[PDB]
Amino acid sequence: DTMKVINDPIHGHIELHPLLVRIIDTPQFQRLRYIKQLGGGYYVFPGASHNRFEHSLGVGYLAGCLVHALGEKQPELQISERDVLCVQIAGLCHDLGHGPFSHMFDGRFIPLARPEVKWTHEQGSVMMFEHLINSNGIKPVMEQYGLIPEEDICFIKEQIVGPLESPVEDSLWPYKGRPENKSFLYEIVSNKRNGIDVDKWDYFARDCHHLGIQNNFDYKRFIKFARVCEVDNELRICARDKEVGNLYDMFHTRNSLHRRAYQHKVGNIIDTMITDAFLKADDYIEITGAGGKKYRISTAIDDMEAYTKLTDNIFLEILYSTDPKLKDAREILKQIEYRNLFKYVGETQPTGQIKIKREDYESLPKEVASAKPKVLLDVKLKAEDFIVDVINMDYGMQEKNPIDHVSFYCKTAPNRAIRITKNQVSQLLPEKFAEQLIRVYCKKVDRKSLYAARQYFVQWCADRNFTKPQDGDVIAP
Amino acid sequence: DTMKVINDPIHGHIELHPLLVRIIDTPQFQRLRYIKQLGGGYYVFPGASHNRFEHSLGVGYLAGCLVHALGEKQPELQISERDVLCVQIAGLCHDLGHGPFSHMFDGRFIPLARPEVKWTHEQGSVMMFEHLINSNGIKPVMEQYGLIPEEDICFIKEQIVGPLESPVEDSLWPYKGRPENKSFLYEIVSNKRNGIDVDKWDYFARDCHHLGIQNNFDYKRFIKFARVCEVDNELRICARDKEVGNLYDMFHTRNSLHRRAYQHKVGNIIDTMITDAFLKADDYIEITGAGGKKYRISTAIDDMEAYTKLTDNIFLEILYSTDPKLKDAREILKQIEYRNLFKYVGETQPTGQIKIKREDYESLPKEVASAKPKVLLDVKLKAEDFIVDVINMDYGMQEKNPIDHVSFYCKTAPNRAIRITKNQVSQLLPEKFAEQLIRVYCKKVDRKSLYAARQYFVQWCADRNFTKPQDGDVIAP
Amino acid sequence: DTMKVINDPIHGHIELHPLLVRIIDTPQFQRLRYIKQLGGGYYVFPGASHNRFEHSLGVGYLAGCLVHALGEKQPELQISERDVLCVQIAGLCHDLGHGPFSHMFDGRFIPLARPEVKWTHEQGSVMMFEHLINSNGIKPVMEQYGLIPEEDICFIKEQIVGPLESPVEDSLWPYKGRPENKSFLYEIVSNKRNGIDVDKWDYFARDCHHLGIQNNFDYKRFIKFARVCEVDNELRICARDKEVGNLYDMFHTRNSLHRRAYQHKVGNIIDTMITDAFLKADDYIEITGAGGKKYRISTAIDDMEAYTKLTDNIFLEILYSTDPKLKDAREILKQIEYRNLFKYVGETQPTGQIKIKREDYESLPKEVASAKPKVLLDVKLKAEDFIVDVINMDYGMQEKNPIDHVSFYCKTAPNRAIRITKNQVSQLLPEKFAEQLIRVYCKKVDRKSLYAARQYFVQWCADRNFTKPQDGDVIAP
Amino acid sequence: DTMKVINDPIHGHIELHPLLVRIIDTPQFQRLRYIKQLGGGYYVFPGASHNRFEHSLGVGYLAGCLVHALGEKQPELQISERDVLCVQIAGLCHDLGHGPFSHMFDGRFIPLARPEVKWTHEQGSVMMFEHLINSNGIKPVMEQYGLIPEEDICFIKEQIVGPLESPVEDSLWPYKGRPENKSFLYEIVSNKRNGIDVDKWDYFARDCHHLGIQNNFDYKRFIKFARVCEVDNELRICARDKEVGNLYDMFHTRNSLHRRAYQHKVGNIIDTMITDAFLKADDYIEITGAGGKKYRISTAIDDMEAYTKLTDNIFLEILYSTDPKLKDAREILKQIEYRNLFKYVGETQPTGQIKIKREDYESLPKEVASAKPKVLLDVKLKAEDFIVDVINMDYGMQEKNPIDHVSFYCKTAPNRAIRITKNQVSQLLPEKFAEQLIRVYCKKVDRKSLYAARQYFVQWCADRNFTKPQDGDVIAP
Ligand SMILES: Nc1ncnc2c1ncn2[C@H]1C[C@H](O)[C@@H](COP(=O)(O)NP(=O)(O)OP(=O)(O)O)O1
Ligand SMILES: Nc1ncnc2c1ncn2[C@H]1C[C@H](O)[C@@H](COP(=O)(O)NP(=O)(O)OP(=O)(O)O)O1
Ligand SMILES: Nc1ncnc2c1ncn2[C@H]1C[C@H](O)[C@@H](COP(=O)(O)NP(=O)(O)OP(=O)(O)O)O1
Ligand SMILES: Nc1ncnc2c1ncn2[C@H]1C[C@H](O)[C@@H](COP(=O)(O)NP(=O)(O)OP(=O)(O)O)O1
Ligand SMILES: [Fe+3]
Ligand SMILES: [Fe+3]
Ligand SMILES: [Fe+3]
Ligand SMILES: [Fe+3]
Ligand SMILES: [Mg+2]
Ligand SMILES: [Mg+2]
Ligand SMILES: [Mg+2]
Ligand SMILES: [Mg+2]
Ligand SMILES: [Mg+2]
Ligand SMILES: [Mg+2]
Ligand SMILES: [Mg+2]
Ligand SMILES: [Mg+2]
Ligand SMILES: [Mg+2]
Ligand SMILES: [Mg+2]
Ligand SMILES: [Mg+2]
Ligand SMILES: [Mg+2]
């Protein structure tokens, strides 16, 4: 029941409150030691072997630091230690709902296995937090340190997910955990207004440390010049006008990361292969949940006791199996182990403001196969031999400019906020803020099938009006 | 079949020969992605989640770099590209035989489970290298690049392990892979004379990067001033006389690491608990090997096909099990998951150089139990409630001075080596080079049992003529 | 006469040829130990106290590394050790002509003191190299190591400066040092087609290390994928087509640095004050040159012996002086020592494609003073109380896109180069590549004077059809 | 009059109180921008170009951080903001008395130029602090922020230097700035009991950053486990018992630095040459002080107004001079500029516990010359051709063990301290804690002179009962 100290390779030595220590030392939280932060990227970057455990620790520490600084430099906000504990707990448990290989589970697998439900890992995080609190007798411990569980659990849940109860924007306050007087406390762990939060800072630093790519953003300088100001009967976190350029750079940094590591094409195809292996391995793996009931890999998100035992272990559970009824997924994983991967064909961009919707992906391989090239190639390829991948690259707000939703204050008048437009900053800033990319892969790896795949790709690219391949003079001359 | 580039957060961008790529892309080598470098230390240092895969990559790269530099600066040594390839292959496969949690498997488990055999992970590395070469059709590929497999496989094996075939030192050359005039090539990956090799450099850098501690050794400076000289009809690697102090510091660094991370009290007790869980879980886990035969965790080192599937996965295989025959090991692992660990009692050193030998460990708990305090508490304790751990801290040569087996050359006469004694360097250097420590833990966490545990500890420590317990006045007033 | 090793905090240990050591150990080169790399920026960033000596060392080392790698990977280019020595010498002596406080000497002082000559520090570098070679007896030493002085001195000079003796582009080869089949050797130290050279890499790394701003560019990866290909009967350095995005990022990095450190407001005004102090201190400082002749600060660029003694020392020579004729410059420097600096008024951007040319700067303060604001204040400010600074921010080629002059090759056909347009890369790239900024400062430092100065500034900005003052509703409401 | 932020490459962004800003913006403090931290070491390590300005900033910041942490974690000590300001000011102004090239001014020059006075740079720091406070009207500003100048100036002075007023240890409190119940505040900036203070931490970090050698000490961990406890009716700073080994390592680190950078042979001989040049240049340089009086380089420490203008500038003042009376020192500096340095002959250690005292250095070269070697030597060397340098390497307390004066506390009883002996820690620790080294250099640089010099060196070493030369079988066979 004393302050603990833990050493971090990203931050320094970190202090942990006894209640935080109690929360951490449970099976539900310890589950995070066995889930990769970057999923399949570890198969392209050999140094990316870190897990969500240290990421959660860092996010909690940074949330605590930011709230402490805000309270210290401006003591009329009425920030109490109860609020500090609540914010730290919310930051600590914000990723309890990630599945095997993180985003691959909720970005690729669940959509294809159970296409009738809508599910995100934040909902899973809320459910897992409820399960953790109920199964470990934590409410008395919270009451022992001055928390009020009925209000505070709701406050933490609303910190992890949106306002909840669905919105009705007729000039109303949607939240319930805290009054509007402290609305800024909802902008720390996850910022729904412009996307500036400590989670980005933490994973920027940690991913740059582990990948071998050097980071360019400085969050301590941002914390130095941060303030709280009243805007439109709404207290929000504001930066200083002289930091505006830095903010732009931050988003640039994020984009760069997505373009170098998270959307690497070999890593993406490896993730696709793992998803296909899981799809084939389904209907045969059993997980025991509450009441001795059995669950599927796809239905395990309906029971937290069963979901607690679903980690990256399942991967090695399929590779080492001997059951003759799991042979196909085992063959796929073995092919992964030999680097016999699906081969990349080409890439393209839409020209105009036309975009591919989510519910139109399944037909793309059919249209690539259905094309009729002019040149006559010997081999014929079916629509089952093609994989089409769509990538959405934006600044986090669907072609909106995030910096237009930030408030700024001047040195001479620190208690009044303003807005800055893009033309008041620089002429060298980007013009657009969202785009799509399309990659095409072929499953048949014959040196002959690749030529046919390229011919169909170029014909489909030409007739769809989707620009032309970069190397239109090298691979298709 | 072209040079391949890979990015490492320790060494940067690294080039790989196509034969190396063929060797890497096999199940036997890909096994190393699922075994941690530090084992249980990951449960004390949250950033130590790296595996043997990147360590092997780095060791191979550094071996190649050192041999290239030596060849470049001395063109009369007759170093060929065949030798470079062989040395790189040997460095790449040096830790190919580690088991689950690395040194825990061959340091704690095998000795207790099968105490009639003598086994090290280098023998396993040799066996696994043979299995890898035979199971993947590599000999033709080696022949394609100018290697002679019958000589070169023996050379690589002799690089990984000692001279082999038992020694008879009557003025003879024990090795077979290479003649006498290439002997220095046996000092790169593993140095049996004084212990200076690239493996130490690599894990120093990597462990310090991941743990959050900065190292003070520079190996590039050492490579700059390295040379090859003839000593007693033996060609060996020599450093320059001005680097002697640096060499001492290097060993100091190693000791410091062992005293901070590798021999941490909580990490060691966690490793002990995991070993106990594996001991109880044995006789119930089955692994399929060649011919459809079944193997135990302890007997899996007798078949390489079965050994290929034995990784850290087994840990999570026991925790998630439902078989009633595995309840005890599962209970122990669950205890670990709650931080309900065995409690540390005390520590001591032998003063009179009466080093406790290996075959006296099992009786130590009896001696701690079988000891009558003067004061009476009436709580009692069986000998089954005590854990005694013996730690050997040395400079790698069992109380010998390693720097006495190093050769040095001067600037004016670069082609003649000399020796330097400890009194020609400094008076502030260590006077001994080996020591022992003894730690005691109790398996009952009652606030009452802890007091009796330390009463027996102090009585037995006083009895055995050892030192008095440090800071004893506080815990034993 | 043996290879020398030197330790660098940016790179590692660096090897130096005996001829390089002879060149370094001369007064002309040792002069660089007393000129700062960033000039007045040291008065805003306390860690920027490095000089040009280490920068020159690093540039030479990197030039050698790049040429060595290019020769190693393509034996048909016929790169000899003579070329390596010549390139290293050119990289080592590329900044011999910098004056006190580096860019402010040839960017601010010489233009204002002697506005009838056109002078850059590269011409000074060539003259100083000639002086160094002639006054130290280096030609026989060059002949001792296989160099041919008559051709090689011209080659080095043409490496430091352009083709020389003016061009006539009627399909001719302008250079003389080397034939047309080694033209790529002219693209290493200073690149004229685009701005990709080792000098940028070196000062990026060093300035990021010293300022406390972290770097984002990786030049080793660039060296890994570099190649030489024939383009339009020109042998040129081409990059790998998958690195195009990285190249864009590089220029972004450069811009960021200019926006954060090199064009800081307070640093620029401090440089302006130092330039004014030097202007007033002239007519009174005497420097002895060849033949016992005396020279001025402004006329010292006409004699290299006199120029050798002109370093940052002159600064402290004025501050510690006692002559009554140097009193005004001493007062200005003393005011600098108290942070009684000229106060910043405002900033603005041109709206359209109109730009302020060089020969219109002197009249700008008159225009600002001559403006008639609407509201009336008692205080009247003359044109002598205003300072106007014009900043040009571009990608190094005056609103042209540098990436349009880069050549790329594909993996399948490594011996044929291609071009990539901006629309084949991304839609998030900048639209324009150059812009101007205008800052205004006032010399009178009382509050009424500042209010009046900003009234004139806003009136003039409105009059001349420029953008809004960012704080158009805060400081001017 | 607002908190000011400054960016540091060693620490992060640092906050500065307005009073600190007023103190910094004065000529006396700004003088530190032109004195180098390592003196002549910059001529061996090209990256060591930093000055005392940033070192003072860092020391002040770290003192503030430590006092803040101590006050925060233990609020019964009654630490006020007045104490924080006083401690920060003391840390900020602790090196105001350093002269040109720092330690060589008060370590080599003053002893030889004025052998009748005893002078250290801390006395100069106290005098310069008095001059700064009196010449800039700071007392009213201190009164404006709650300080009491009469007590507080004395407190700061006693922080920079010892107790003052000469000691009489008959159970009395020697200090006067603060009462006996705040005594721990005297252990922060400069620790006279055991030598553990923030100044060591700062220059460890900064010198490691600039030299290119990685640091091994972590001071943040030390601050985490620091506490204040009553020892013998004396409140003192105590560490945690588990950190004892770390403390040893810290001192090891210090020794290593002294053995690598600060006592480098070439750096020391360069410092000796600069000292000789200053000795010859004296009697001819005039500095103006108070009342229009003129002072010498050696007598400038008697007037603070004259001392304010004495920096490294004097170096370049002699090199660029034209007066015929300064010709010898100019020749010496010019010889330095060519690397025509005094040549190193040999090194030796005393065998027994006999040590060379300070007042026997002048006769050492006479003893070396007066030796009569047996072998026949061609040339004869006078005693003016020899230089003998004596180096004392200790742990900072004249062969005493510093760790014997540290107090420790246990987790169970955090309010009562203990002592730990060297045998309770490890058997691998050093046996002795101080030693002496003697280097010999020759001024005549021809080969015959070097051979003769080493013949005399070996004969004298044999005579004086010293350890034989390391390479006694290489250079003198
Ligand atoms: N010398 C060292 N240097 C850096 N980090 C270290 C370290 N030693 C440990 N760590 C890391 C390891 C951990 O991540 C963290 C805590 O290590 P402990 O201070 O050993 N904490 P514990 O609970 O064992 O001692 P107690 O309960 O008696 O107070 O710092
Ligand atoms: N911008 C970047 N910056 C740093 N590292 C990067 C990187 N991009 C990838 N890496 C890492 C990832 C890897 O660890 C390593 C090589 O990845 P690649 O060469 O980019 N991809 P592949 O081998 O398929 O190119 P090829 O067409 O020639 O086959 O560098
Ligand atoms: N332990 C060390 N660690 C890192 N850098 C060091 C160093 N010692 C010196 N340096 C730095 C200092 C220099 O920048 C560079 C050379 O130092 P020297 O090896 O001492 N070269 P010298 O000419 O004195 O010895 P010789 O002529 O007998 O071969 O490395
Ligand atoms: N983007 C940046 N990133 C890192 N450091 C920076 C920086 N910009 C400046 N620094 C460094 C430079 C300095 O060492 C320090 C302060 O820079 P200012 O924030 O510019 N302070 P000032 O007084 O000019 O603005 P005001 O008075 O309006 O508040 O941080
Ligand atoms: Fe997150
Ligand atoms: Fe190893
Ligand atoms: Fe340059
Ligand atoms: Fe200091
Ligand atoms: Mg603990
Ligand atoms: Mg999340
Ligand atoms: Mg988010
Ligand atoms: Mg590839
Ligand atoms: Mg091994
Ligand atoms: Mg070994
Ligand atoms: Mg040397
Ligand atoms: Mg230049
Ligand atoms: Mg340029
Ligand atoms: Mg300011
Ligand atoms: Mg001092
Ligand atoms: Mg001291």
JSON list of C-alpha atoms in Angstrom, two decimals, chain C residues 1-5 15-18 21:
[
{"chain": "C", "resi": 1, "resn": "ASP", "atom": "CA", "xyz": [52.96, 9.72, -42.00]},
{"chain": "C", "resi": 2, "resn": "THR", "atom": "CA", "xyz": [50.48, 7.10, -40.77]},
{"chain": "C", "resi": 3, "resn": "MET", "atom": "CA", "xyz": [46.69, 6.91, -40.65]},
{"chain": "C", "resi": 4, "resn": "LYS", "atom": "CA", "xyz": [45.32, 9.06, -37.81]},
{"chain": "C", "resi": 5, "resn": "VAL", "atom": "CA", "xyz": [42.16, 8.44, -35.77]},
{"chain": "C", "resi": 15, "resn": "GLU", "atom": "CA", "xyz": [40.41, 7.84, -40.14]},
{"chain": "C", "resi": 16, "resn": "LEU", "atom": "CA", "xyz": [42.54, 10.55, -41.74]},
{"chain": "C", "resi": 17, "resn": "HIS", "atom": "CA", "xyz": [45.14, 10.19, -44.47]},
{"chain": "C", "resi": 18, "resn": "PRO", "atom": "CA", "xyz": [48.59, 11.74, -43.81]},
{"chain": "C", "resi": 21, "resn": "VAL", "atom": "CA", "xyz": [46.64, 15.71, -41.61]}
]
